[PDB]
Design a protein around this ligand. Structure first.
Ligand code: ADP
Ligand code: CL
Ligand code: CL
Ligand code: CL
Ligand code: CL
Ligand code: K
Ligand code: K
Ligand code: K
Ligand code: K
Ligand code: MG
Ligand code: MG
Ligand code: MG
Ligand code: MG
Lengths: 500, 502, 502, 500
């Protein structure tokens, strides 16, 4: 480690201190940060994308929250905020309890498939009616992100009984996992409805597709998008499909899924089920690596600052956990309970940002570039060659910025794949192109009315980047754009400019 | 990363973990595992080294525990257990609480801290071992307690006390450590520490001195002077006891290169590097120091308490396992259990978990990349043993050997092989038990203690037989054997055999 | 080697050499190719640079030849021809023979050598230009004649002569060069050489001074002082004429690093490094000096006469072609024809052969290995032009471009691109002819001279059109274009375009 | 180039001077060095292998020469000399002339298929009776190692007429080449006879198989060896087959030929025919590289010191030519006319040796080892792993020698493949194993009565190597051998010993 020890040589000196975070941040929006004032708070602390978990909320609160995010967005024109719909999918939920939270290690616990039943510390409810017919005796049934472990003793007609293996006092519409076993579709009636009549209807940027198990699941979601063009004038939506790997089937079929998807989302808590706890990091590190090579953005969806749901400070363990997620090659990190129903959403996003910024300094960039550069077969398409020259030139002359003028975001995604030390600024006229880039590592975006006068776009971008403390006068920047006529002809070029 | 994805390809198949842990494990010995039956329990779950924290216990319990470890050692002749004395040094401690029970401090509350150690403290007022506490703190100063779990800010400074605003909701017990601003106001090696080194570590022939709060090369040179001067208990030959320098402050990090060079090993804990290094920067220091050690060929211990939840629980968290795995991937030779073994409800389960996670994380190491990295760091020409060490590791990989055997009087070649970080378990065959124990912080070194090492053919036969009974190798598998010949080689020489297990 | 075996896979298929030579060619101008029609002949077969060896000719023939080269230049506007003055320097020459005819010396015979230059010599007695010849030789000393083709051993030393035992059966002509023991007894830059530089090279605005027998940096600094002091013929601006230091003795080899640094290029001949370096060691020196030049980014010329057989024959030998190929593979920017063009029977055929062999040897270069080698030799950060140069060469490879175009007022970026040794022909577009001519020793640089370079879009259009008519590129093929923008970039900048040939 | 410039740094210093040649040397035996005193002369100057070109000589002179080589061999017990039979094969020869040597550019030259005809400067003879029926008009016919070029004007019943393209005065049973066109077998009646009743009969070491065109040609030669066991007690001879690539067919089929053969022989003069002169080096460099990877010894058979047939000194061009042959990766070089019918055989071998020694110092060994090491797939057989450790250890501790005790020469051939800077000494009880190793780069051999006491073999080898100025007291040597019992078991090992 060379870059990591240059980091330690700075820790041992009096001096300024310069770090700008490139890892994108997803914030799960809920009661704790639902209003316009909180969402502006999250944007300032470094929210890249707003996540709506459609496992929670109702028709009314979903619409209200969308309006609040977009009102908060208008109050910060220099920050672009992506909006992600996270599908319910074939999840299984506990039913509601009598009053509040109930369970002691060694006890038996009954689970009924009558959801309309107020549960206690002996009998609880289950949303899955085929629960007895999809379980054997000795089967492990995990509850609440796999915090409560149980073993099935008895299987009835419309119930099961489970031996509790943990002392814990948590409940109320928490998730249930049935490892190795679930006769539910990946994209059900509700999910096809939520995609068409919310994600497509209100022109969202990301569908986080829950429990993806093979390429065909992603092809199905793409078919729904191409078939339902009613809310986009008859042009298929450019909304991005982020496949969530939540089970061993997904891991087995990763190569196919990763290829079909626009991105990948992995959580340690989900893979916990069928894959032994001491093996999960193997799967997570490999899938992230595979994504880095494929040039597909990967999100570490792991809840990594759990202590910050109740505390204003995290633990040292939690910071090391985030740092390793970044060093593993994560494009993007995610806050769940810390933002959605926690006491310190702003502090949680702030901590996540600072740790990410620090972990990014320990990346040996040369090693990483030459690794990815040698993975792509030659010859390549012009944009990918321009992308490489941008990243190479930037390093060679110690530029602080890479600016790309784009109608699609193609060149920005390609530059992001080569993982430069410099912040990427994607200058575009199309807001959905700007929002769509907000899971890509290191991509800030500037939304303009025109991109036709390249000299002016680069001038205005350098000026705005100056006011965002990304660059100073005399510093180098790489500018990248196409020319349509008299280049001669059409072309793509790369300028090494100086910030005035 | 290709080794990581070969790991994932196995997760998705019908087969049956075929993995042997190479990362060494230190177990802190205390009330929870003090007896002979518990210590045998720790050996079976994979204890490499027994740690005596001389911040705790008294003259009687220290000696009693030493006898118990060595009785447990006799009950497992095929496992070698190193014994480490961890010095008190210039630490600062909280006093006793009211007839026990851990107090629940609430964020926002005030906490008084007195210089009268003989005072039974409560959830408003606690004690401090350091009499110059008020004269070494300003108002607004952060004072960290219990491996920096409780953060507090000083409101008032009295004659012989301070008052502190608690910044955390947290539950802390008795005689926990305190950290104060600066870069240690006491001697590194005091009267007690020079006494503990000479009249315990040297007197009872221990294997490791874990030197607390090392701040520069001179601190290690001082400890070496004490060892060389005090030869009374070792017939007049300086003890070969190994000095493991603990980096517990920014001064130590600044002076690491010097410390690392002087020391036989290095010990780092995330919990100690609290203060002066911001929490979000510590991993930078820890990863760099571990890397530097890997290059230098000095064993490095991650002393971080990483399975804290297992002090009260039978199972760890998924976060804690990922934390251990990353410590191993970062390049740790050695991991450490503190509260999990010393005063916890599940010592055996804690060591078991640590072992299994370590074994899994080791499969994700890209070995070729790591070997060629370290091989190209050493300048040529080299000493014969280091050339033999490289050929052992190369040959082992080339023919897919399961074992590297070294017959040694010193442990020199074993330490060298360990530095090149082979996938194969190293077995150091020796007639000197202190050579065997001394190797137990070196990544991947198991040891076989014999009465003689004179007949090389027999030592290798017996080692392959023992390795067979330890499920390290099977019949028909290749092993690399490495030893010297004293006469008629011709002359003296060092050689490397590619043998087959019968 | 994989590029070499891709070459062999093409030798075994139905297709049709698609290859353009990048190695530059120097042609020595003399009686055999002195007229305007011959020089146009040399341009068409691939002459990069015209060499005037001022060891030969007189004031009149030098001026006449210069006019002929420049008239030939006007008759081929799309080809740029550099003009090189090769200094006499401290050389020693044989005198004239009896009304001509080359003498046949037989191994074992004696040969007398007199200090009376005005003496018509025979196959027993020849002349010498150096009056201190007897006073700078011992008995048994080896005296080499005609680029070290005739070896002789001194038997007797007289007042104003020596007698030598011939060691070779060989046929030598008039006014050939002599080499004597030591590490040059004359000035490097004499009265004649300072005169030839100022009142010919500078006076008539030549492009290269080939500085004979350079022995250290100070020799090159002296030549630079003469150029900077004598600005009379260039309006008071120091001439941008390029100094190519010739390493012709062991002193030069010893001091190479210094010489190479001071010089704009380097010239080495196997024939010169005769004596003090054993014949079987010369390739060691030549390969090393060429390598050093490749790293330093200074153009190096293999001045070795490699097609000697083609002075009398229409065809070369297979040995001579392998010799040229290896000169190119060794990393030569530039090759040279001497007798083959200057006084030979087949100048056009000689240049033609040199071109075809060079083109073939260039296909066997593993380019990736060569780029990453030179890229990792330069420390970061770098100047903008060198970063643009790298991106040009990388982009060119990545998208399989056939051309790299650079618009330049200096030739700076062209020289930098040339240093990274791309597979693509470089076209340096410039308004200054002396910038175009100055680039003609740089590997792979063709040049296009325009009246203006103000409209970048038009320069690139016209360059692609001209490159199309020179069979360098076809419609639909990619080209890299590289130039500065002076205003509204924003500001000034340097950029790289990936364009398509129409 | 690092090693090449360390060579130049030594050229510029006062100091000792230490080089030992590893490239093996083949000497073609003929009238100029036919007697016992000359052959001892060649051994001292550095002859590795004696070549009998069976295109020349008769039954009597072949046998006489074999006796002389073996008498010369007995007079130098510390030097092992391999003996190579070079087959006539499907070659074509000019007939004899009237008295002495005759031809002017532009003239016509008649060629008759009546071999029993004394030829002049208008009409010459040809050994190939099907010459008119295997040529078209405008076909190029090369004579005397392709020195005389001609174009065919007319084709008769039993003749052709050719336009001479060169002024040259050379003749008398010289070779003829017909590029692109020859209805002769690779192994004819004479060649099967020469192999069985000379090479096998008198227990020679190498068959240099002329004009090999594919794997099947080598398989045929191996069939002859396995079928004819009469002169070797019924055990197939371990004689080595060196396939000569003399035409484009051979180059096309190289991979197959190289795989089947024990070695490869390439001459620039032979490939000159069908492959344009300016392309030959491409073929030669590639085939040598391919051999280096495959671990098969390759001989540069090119006549490279032609000037030394008449002169006591070579040209600077000729030395550079030899040096490049070595740097290209040649295991072995060859003298033809320089030894066979030249004025200075001893000087020719001496020059070849000195140049080879110098060119070997310019080899960057690390680059070459890691190149070949990464070409072999793992896992490997024990001997190849021992071979690598030998070469690695040798470099790491700067050993001067690698000693291998062998019954087969297997480990010596493997060590030779990894191209160490150190001389390899193959200690063996079997002389034909010693002789068989003499084309392998850097292998000297010591023939003993026993190899059973390993300690004594290594002692005696270090002592002999001391007397051969290969090593001094205190210098390191690598020793490599098998142990049959009590290793424990059987094994192969590598010792780092010190020369006493
Ligand atoms: N849209 C929402 N409406 C109400 N509560 C929400 C919403 N989104 C999240 N939450 C709350 O915040 C928590 C954040 O966790 P998250 O990962 O989104 O859900 P889950 O508990 O299903 O894993 C949820 O558990 C829930 O208590
Ligand atoms: Cl943005
Ligand atoms: Cl052990
Ligand atoms: Cl040109
Ligand atoms: Cl030999
Ligand atoms: K969901
Ligand atoms: K302690
Ligand atoms: K000259
Ligand atoms: K033959
Ligand atoms: Mg969740
Ligand atoms: Mg502790
Ligand atoms: Mg000359
Ligand atoms: Mg021949």
């Amino acid at each position: 480690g060379k870059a990591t020890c240059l980091g330690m040589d700075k820790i041992c000196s009096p001096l300024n201190d310069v770090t700008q975070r490139k890892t994108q941040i997803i914030c799960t929006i809920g009661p704790s940060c639902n209003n316009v004032e909180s969402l502006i708070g999250l944007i300032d602390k470094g929210m890249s994308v707003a996540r709506l978990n459609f496992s929670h909320g109702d028709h009314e609160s979903h619409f209200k929250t969308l309006q609040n995010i977009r009102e908060a967005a208008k109050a910060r024109p220099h920050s672009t905020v992506g909006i992600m719909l996270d599908t319910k999918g074939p999840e299984i939920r506990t039913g509601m309890l009598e009053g509040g939270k109930p369970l002691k290690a060694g006890q038996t616990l009954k689970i009924t498939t009558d959801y309309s039943m107020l549960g206690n510390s002996e009998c609880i409810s289950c949303s899955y009616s085929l629960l007895p017919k999809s379980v054997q005796i000795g089967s492990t049934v995990l509850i609440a992100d796999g915090s409560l472990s149980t073993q099935v003793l008895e299987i009835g007609d419309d119930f099961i009984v489970c031996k509790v293996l943990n002392s814990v006092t948590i409940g109320e519409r928490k998730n249930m996992n049935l490892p190795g076993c679930v006769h539910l579709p990946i994209i059900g009636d509700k999910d096809r409805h939520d995609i068409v009549d919310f994600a497509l209807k209100y022109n969202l940027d990301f569908i986080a597709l829950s429990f993806v198990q093979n390429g065909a699941d992603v092809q199905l979601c793409r078919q729904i998008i191409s078939e339902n063009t009613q809310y986009s004038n008859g042009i298929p939506s450019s909304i991005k499909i982020i496949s969530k790997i939540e089970n061993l089937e997904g891991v087995i079929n990763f190569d196919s899924i990763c290829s079909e998807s626009d991105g990948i989302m992995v959580a340690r808590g989900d893979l916990g089920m069928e894959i032994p706890p001491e093996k999960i990091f193997v799967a997570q590190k490999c899938m992230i690596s595979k994504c880095n090579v494929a040039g597909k953005p990967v999100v570490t969806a792991t809840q990594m600052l759990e202590s910050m749901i109740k505390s204003n400070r995290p633990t040292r363990a939690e910071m090391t956990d985030v740092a390793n997620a970044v060093l593993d090659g994560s494009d993007c990190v995610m806050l769940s309970g810390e933002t959605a129903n926690g006491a310190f959403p702003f502090d949680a996003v702030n901590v996540m940002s600072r740790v990410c910024a620090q972990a990014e300094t320990c990346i040996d960039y040369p090693v990483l570039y030459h690794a990815i550069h040698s993975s792509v077969p030659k010859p390549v398409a012009v944009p990918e060659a321009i992308a490489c020259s941008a990243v190479e030139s930037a390093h060679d002359v110690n530029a602080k910025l890479i600016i790309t003028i784009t109608e699609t975001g193609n060149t920005a995604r390609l530059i992001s794949k080569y993982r430069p030390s410099q912040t990427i600024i994607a200058c575009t006229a199309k807001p959905e192109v700007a929002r769509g880039l907000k899971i890509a590592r290191g991509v800030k975006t500037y939304v303009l009315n025109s991109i036709h006068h390249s000299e002016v776009v680069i001038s205005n971008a350098l000026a705005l980047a100056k006011e965002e403390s990304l660059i100073e006068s005399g510093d180098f920047a790489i500018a990248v754009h196409g020319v349509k006529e008299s280049c001669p002809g059409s072309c793509n070029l790369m300028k090494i400019v100086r910030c005035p």
